Design a protein around this ligand. Structure first.
Ligand SMILES: O=C(O)C[C@H](S)C(=O)O
Ligand SMILES: O=C(O)C[C@H](S)C(=O)O
Ligand code: SF4
Ligand code: SF4
Lengths: 540, 540
């Protein structure tokens, strides 16, 4: 018929989003000549202030709705004891990080910025560079982590030492506002954004539920649940499906129409599938990292148009580092989403000593490794532990380099054969404090090194977060080693309560990915893989 | 560690891109008051004309470099005979479609538009709506296909009848130019954009070579090779990796720095890996759809920075419908990339009879199917055929609706048991011509219907394009049916030379996805799966 323009996705409000005013500075309304409307001149320093403040706030603060979801776990009669134990560490973590000495997570993430500059906004300068200065500034000032590696070739890399580059996308809109979304996206949650190339034949109730049942297990516990799950069914391209997925997991689309109207847009939020997806998450068994009901806080499902030959599907999560802030600049100043500044009020009234039936088994790590293995071998998987002593810290790059050494005929470093290995990379150490945020790394990315290193007598006791592949279960059964699982997410509580001394041992060029040697007291862990073929997550 | 702004990706030239002028209309330079620089006013009709013209051209024309890669196949002593037979049909196809009666492919694709509106460009109107109108206008005027389905619910859908919505992304840049890239992205090549979530442990020559060998086979022949292959190693997010991959497969990044410089950007184009990837593709055995060397015309490899914990990898293809155009609007007018206006000069001087040594086997389809199955059963896979008679046409939505029928206790439609099945959806029929572009659709998306339908006596002889799953070998072996493969891509040659009558038989609500009944004469096809467990592609 006739031309009726309807956008692919309609414009969306954010009615539950409260903004705090940063300043009425930097902004002036001018009346240009020609046939032009009035314009909003914005000084570039306004962009620097907003991006630095926003990342300051998302690295230390959380949304009230998100904290409220963690607190609801304690009242739920169907939540497991481990669900509640995990949620409480994550609530204590928020209380600690609101003081702004320690960020919530050791991975202060990738800085993602999306701005929408209306045609009536004029900025006399370079937008990306002004936003990058704010990112640079705040990561320099706060006790954050430099996590970005730029390539010097295909295979050689260098940490930039500043957490740049930021990913900045500036879009052209209409009107007299500069709107923004800031995201501090952790790497492990970013690794769990998946694109599934599907077809029309999955687009029926029976097929889609069998599909989603299977695919939702792909996150595992590797992205620190409880999750904010998002699903995008359809899309006009793989890059559009994945962009919308990013937005949906940031809850950017909560106010989108929930029924097609063929008027304001072609894309809608499907409340019915969201409830079905939530139930599958509540029945998946993994719960909040160590068994239970709270795989997911909540779910977002967005249905887009598609080419007849296509049905791209996106699934992804926001992790327990749920870090995003809306912002905007208009003729009334610089505005930033208000996050929760009194997170202590979401802490439940209870003694943590009363949440868990059995007390932790205490393991002295400052023993000969055969002794430590002997003590661990007395306990079945699911056994909660409390660890005290020296630990060697190494993750992706240090493991990659040791594999090169082995392949060159060089021995595995001896410190790998004498201590447990904790996969982690610390954020910067605050003045006068024993440790920066120092939580655990995804254990599955190190699975290709386990059999290799244990065949050299190393990596016999591993401490990290997330479930692992069956090859690690077989390797530990083959050589008699252990995978100890930690709670992922509460890096500030660990830095404050458990990590007593931090030294850089080896591979110092790798920044945060260097080999560290740390002293811990009462570090919490569960036995996840034992020396007999048993895996926590294969049982239930 | 001083602040040194370096973009994620540098700005890129397009030095091999010649632009033709459409008009000096619609643009005026004005000098506004205040402290504002001179501005360029662009009438919204300029965006309508540019988008209308760009899509007119990409649907009918190709880049000269692309035609030359096809023509280079004929002088290559290592090109297979089928490589050349395929290349020749695609060269004839380009010659036909340059008349603008028939588009190169029946799938005129998803309309993708990316714009860069400079700070000094003002459009007194709605850019997105003006670009969609040009898309609307040209799909109405030319004999294109309406391919877009908007949801009425999660599972109910409707074709829009216009090929809207377009995917429009407008970025805010600086300066006095409005730059564009227009892409008509086929559904089948878009389905072969894959996101692989990898880690640092793949980032070594041996692992990355093992990884790429395995993953490059994922395209198969389902996206109508020879491909323009693109690979992106790294990226700051999944949506960025997939965005950059789209551009790289459009050859947008051809002028990118080929070595890191730590100044203009952090991303570079890796010529040494492009050379390794091309060799893997030349040795992969699938060739240009039916065995040979020309799986790939060429290769692009982009290396991006990454979070320490992440290595997203994108792989994708431009299909035989390699459809993109750069454009721009400035103070000197409306510009559009010049595509090849005389493709006939790229046809080799050779008789098509001289290319293949064994003649095609002629199969009369106007017989009882047991006769046709007996005739086809005389021949092994790879046997070239030439088919004449009646064929039923049905693909995705029509199969899904017949699967609904069977589960309800409704019989498989009788026409499915009486004729060969052609998976295809036609573009609009030109006035006074027997058929619109009417090439084949990807056969693998119908694999879930094969065993089901043959168990009801239907779909015994299938005609489509691309390799299929092992469950189709077993179903044809179980029930005694055949999958005959055709060359994908040259939909205009088929409409001109092979398709003699077209009728809509059933399911007319589904538009191009309705069930059709066509008469073909000398339609070429190869036996790809027979009634004995043999697969063309399981034997190289
Ligand atoms: O880099 C880290 O510290 C942890 C990352 S965010 C992860 O694996 O989830
Ligand atoms: O939709 C079509 O006509 C064919 C698509 S592009 C495909 O399967 O390749
Ligand atoms: S909460 Fe877990 S997944 Fe998220 S950034 Fe922190 S360690 Fe990574
Ligand atoms: S050339 Fe093949 S893959 Fe590309 S749009 Fe046409 S039918 Fe689809």
């Amino acid at each position: 018929a006739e031309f009726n323009f309807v956008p692919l996705v309609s414009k969306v409000s954010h009615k539950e989003t409260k903004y705090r005013l940063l300043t009425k500075d930097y902004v002036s309304v001018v009346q240009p000549g020609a046939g032009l409307p009035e314009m909003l001149r914005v000084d570039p320093a306004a962009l620097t202030l907003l991006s630095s403040t926003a990342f300051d706030d998302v690295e230390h603060l959380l949304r009230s709705s998100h904290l409220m979801s963690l607190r609801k776990i304690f009242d739920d009669p169907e939540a497991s004891d481990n669900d509640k134990f995990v949620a409480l560490q994550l609530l204590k973590n928020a209380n600690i990080s609101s003081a702004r000495l320690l960020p919530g997570c050791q991975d202060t993430g990738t800085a993602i910025i999306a701005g929408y500059r209306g045609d009536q906004v004029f900025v006399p300068g370079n937008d990306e560079e002004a936003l990058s200065r704010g990112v640079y500034d705040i990561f320099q000032k706060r006790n954050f982590r430099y996590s970005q590696n730029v390539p010097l070739s295909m295979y050689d890399e260098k940490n930039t030492g500043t957490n740049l580059p930021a990913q900045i996308d500036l879009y052209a809109s209409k009107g007299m506002e500069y709107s923004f979304m800031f995201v501090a996206k952790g790497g492990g949650s970013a690794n769990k954004s998946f694109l599934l190339q599907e077809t029309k034949s999955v687009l029926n109730p029976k097929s889609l539920r069998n599909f989603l049942k299977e695919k939702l297990a792909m996150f595992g516990t590797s992205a620190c649940p409880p999750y904010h799950v998002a699903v995008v069914i359809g899309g006009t391209s793989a890059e559009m499906t994945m962009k919308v997925l990013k937005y949906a997991s940031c809850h950017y689309y909560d106010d989108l129409i929930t029924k097609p109207d063929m008027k304001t847009g072609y894309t809608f939020r499907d409340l019915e599938l969201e409830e079905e997806v939530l139930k599958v998450c509540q029945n998946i068994g993994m719960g909040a990292q160590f068994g239970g009901k709270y795989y997911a806080h909540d779910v977002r499902v967005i249905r887009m148009p598609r080419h007849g030959a296509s049905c791209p599907i996106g699934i992804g999560v926001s992790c327990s580092a749920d870090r995003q802030a809306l912002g905007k600049i208009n003729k009334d100043g610089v505005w930033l989403e208000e996050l929760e500044m009194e997170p202590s009020q979401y802490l439940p009234d209870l003694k943590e000593d009363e949440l868990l039936k059995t007390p932790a088994v205490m393991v002295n790590l400052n023993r000969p490794m055969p002794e430590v293995l002997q003590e661990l071998s007395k306990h079945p998987v699911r056994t909660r532990l409390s660890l005290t002593g020296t630990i060697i810290v190494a993750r992706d790059s240090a493991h990659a380099r040791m594999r090169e050494m082995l392949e060159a005929g060089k021995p595995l470093p001896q410190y790998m054969k004498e201590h447990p290995v904790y996969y982690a990379g610390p954020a910067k150490q605050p003045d006068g404090l024993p440790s920066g945020s120092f939580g655990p790394t995804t254990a599955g990315r190190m699975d290709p090194f386990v059999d290799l290193f244990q065949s050299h007598g190393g990596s016999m006791v591993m401490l990290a977060k997330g479930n692992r592949s069956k090859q690690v279960t077989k390797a530990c059964h083959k050589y008699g080693g252990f995978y100890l699982g930690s709670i992922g997410g509460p890096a500030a509580v660990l830095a404050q309560n458990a990590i007593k001394k931090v030294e850089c041992l080896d591979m110092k060029d790798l920044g945060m990915e260097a080999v560290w040697r740390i002293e811990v007291e009462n570090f919490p862990a569960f036995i996840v893989v034992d020396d007999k073929g048993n895996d926590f997550f294969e049982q239930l």
